[PDB]
Write a protein that holds these residues in place. Structure first.
Motif, short mmCIF file in Angstrom:
data_model
loop_
_atom_site.label_atom_id
_atom_site.label_comp_id
_atom_site.label_asym_id
_atom_site.label_seq_id
_atom_site.Cartn_x
_atom_site.Cartn_y
_atom_site.Cartn_z
N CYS A 95 -7.93 -3.55 5.09
CA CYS A 95 -6.46 -3.62 4.68
C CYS A 95 -5.49 -2.66 5.57
O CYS A 95 -4.33 -3.16 5.53
N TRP B 120 0.74 -1.42 0.15
CA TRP B 120 0.04 0.06 -0.01
C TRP B 120 0.81 1.24 -0.20
O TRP B 120 1.90 1.45 0.50
N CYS C 291 -3.35 -8.70 -0.66
CA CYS C 291 -4.49 -8.62 -1.26
C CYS C 291 -5.01 -9.78 -1.99
O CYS C 291 -4.28 -10.26 -2.73
N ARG D 185 -9.09 -5.40 -3.33
CA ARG D 185 -8.43 -3.98 -3.56
C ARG D 185 -7.00 -3.86 -4.20
O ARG D 185 -6.44 -2.80 -4.02
N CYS E 68 -10.54 -8.81 -0.04
CA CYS E 68 -10.68 -7.25 -0.25
C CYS E 68 -10.96 -7.16 -1.41
O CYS E 68 -11.34 -5.71 -1.88
AG LIG Z 1 -6.23 -5.48 0.52
#
Ligand SMILES: [Ag+]
Ligand SMILES: *[C@@H](O)c1ccccc1N
Ligand SMILES: [Ca+2]
Ligand SMILES: [Ca+2]
Ligand SMILES: [Cl-]
Lengths: 303, 16
Positions: free
Chosen positions: B6, A229, A270, A277, A275
């Motif tokens: 997340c 991320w 992920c 995402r 998720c």
């Molecule tokens: Ag994720």
């Protein structure tokens, strides 16, 4: 935002600042997502046309070697060091490592590990000796801003991040197109297998990968999807950008107040079954002094 | 059951 630092900002030339960066020309793009399976609370929509001024963005997330040079030059102490702990994925905590009883609600795979920080990413006894070119992790938003400012740069806005990550494609699912593994080739480092029980490592990595792994996108950026991320400048909201106005459509900066800062791009954790995402429109957030084993950043700059 | 998570935050673990 008005940060405070304990180091002076060094002088740097435009040529030095631009090394490793790509120039994104001014123009428009289609930001956001309308996948019917997107979680409403994430505010991926609406899809909208956004105009951005020209900017520079790093081809690679900031690496361990680069963060180490920042720390050597400034003495910077990261938020994780000040707090004395950071979040590590459960499968990466060596047995017997001291761990806190802390519970992230709904996410028991996260372990709060005393002594986990950027140079010891799995806690005491771990090191980055074999990861100099991996993305630095356990860096909070504050740490990212401190690095970026020292480097003569800044964090990208969410819109800058997404325009660069989309790499010249109009409303594709991923940085490279609409297929996850075109031609049977892994294009990013995410989870394969059964989350959170078993990562098969089909893409080569069950943790971070080097910042230059996999093919770049059409603008030459690497690992915008997956790996870690990436912190962006904006305060998080799910709906500020639903308004149609110059503030939300021309060089948008996000809401003026908030509690968590935006993170983009997904990570090695992920997976579609949880998720989902790692799509380029995806977005989430974290509070600005938080840090984790799957979160880092890349910088942007005004030319 | 609720939105997947997340980003684990330092604030999230404080509960009494
Ligand atoms: Ag994720
Ligand atoms: C609950 O709603 C849930 C749990 C795990 C993965 C996805 C979703 N939506
Ligand atoms: Ca992987
Ligand atoms: Ca990423
Ligand atoms: Cl490396």
């Amino acid at each position: 935002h008005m940060p405070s630092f304990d180091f002076d900002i060094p002088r740097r030339s435009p040529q030095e600042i631009a090394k490793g960066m790509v120039a994104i020309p001014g123009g428009t793009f289609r930001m956001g997502g309308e996948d019917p399976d997107a979680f409403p609370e994430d505010g991926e929509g609406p899809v909208r046309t956004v105009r951005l001024s020209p900017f520079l963005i790093d081809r690679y997330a900031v690496s361990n070697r680069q963060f180490a040079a920042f720390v050597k030059a400034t003495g910077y102490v990261t938020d994780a060091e000040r707090y004395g702990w950071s979040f590590v994925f459960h499968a990466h905590v060596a047995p017997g490592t001291p761990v806190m009883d802390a519970v992230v609600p709904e996410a028991p795979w996260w372990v709060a590990v005393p002594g986990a920080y950027w140079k010891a990413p799995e806690g005491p006894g771990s090191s980055i000796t074999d990861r100099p070119n991996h993305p630095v992790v356990h860096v909070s938003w504050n740490d990212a801003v401190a690095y970026a400012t020292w480097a003569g740069k800044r964090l990208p806005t969410e819109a800058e991040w997404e325009m660069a990550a989309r790499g010249g494609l109009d409303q594709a699912r991923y940085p490279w197109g609409n297929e996850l593994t075109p031609r049977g080739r892994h294009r990013c480092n995410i989870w394969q297998g059964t989350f959170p029980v078993h990562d098969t490592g089909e893409d080569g990595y069950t943790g971070t990968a080097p910042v230059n792994a996999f093919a770049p996108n059409g603008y030459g950026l690497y690992n915008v999807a997956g790996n870690v991320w990436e912190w962006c400048a904006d305060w998080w909201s799910a709906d500020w950008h639903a308004t149609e106005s110059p503030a939300t459509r021309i060089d948008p900066r996000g809401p003026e107040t908030g509690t968590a800062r935006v993170t983009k791009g997904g990570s090695f954790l992920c997976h579609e079954s949880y998720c989902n995402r790692y799509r380029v429109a995806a977005r989430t957030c974290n509070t600005p002094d938080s840090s984790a084993a799957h979160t880092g950043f890349r910088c942007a700059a005004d030319p | 059951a609720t939105t997947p998570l997340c980003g684990p935050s330092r604030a999230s673990i404080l509960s009494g």
